[PDB]
């Protein structure tokens, strides 16, 4: 705030430092599953980084 | 004290030391009291031990 000058009031008015703060929280889980029967990882999957993991 | 020589009355007057005591104590409190709203501390006082310290 401002006042005046030689005021013969003398007060002064407080002022205030609220400080606030929020937050984030994990709420999703993003996830890509595969089921292989053994049959088909055997004799199927001619390379396994190339079919499976890179899609 | 004085008394006569050979005189068949040994007697001797005792004399007394009484020690006197007196005391001063403080009773007054001289004080000289100045009071500057900032403003007029700022600005009208140019130099201070020449308008507060000295008188």
Chains 1, 2 share one sequence.
Not at 25 to 47: G, M, N
């Amino acid at each position: 705030n401002r006042r005046d000058l030689r005021d013969p009031d003398r007060t002064v008015i407080a002022s205030e430092l609220v400080e606030h703060s929020f937050g984030v929280t994990l709420d999703k889980h993003v996830y890509a599953a595969l089921k292989f029967t053994d049959e088909q990882r055997t004799l199927d999957i001619r390379d396994y980084t190339k079919q499976v993991l890179m899609p």
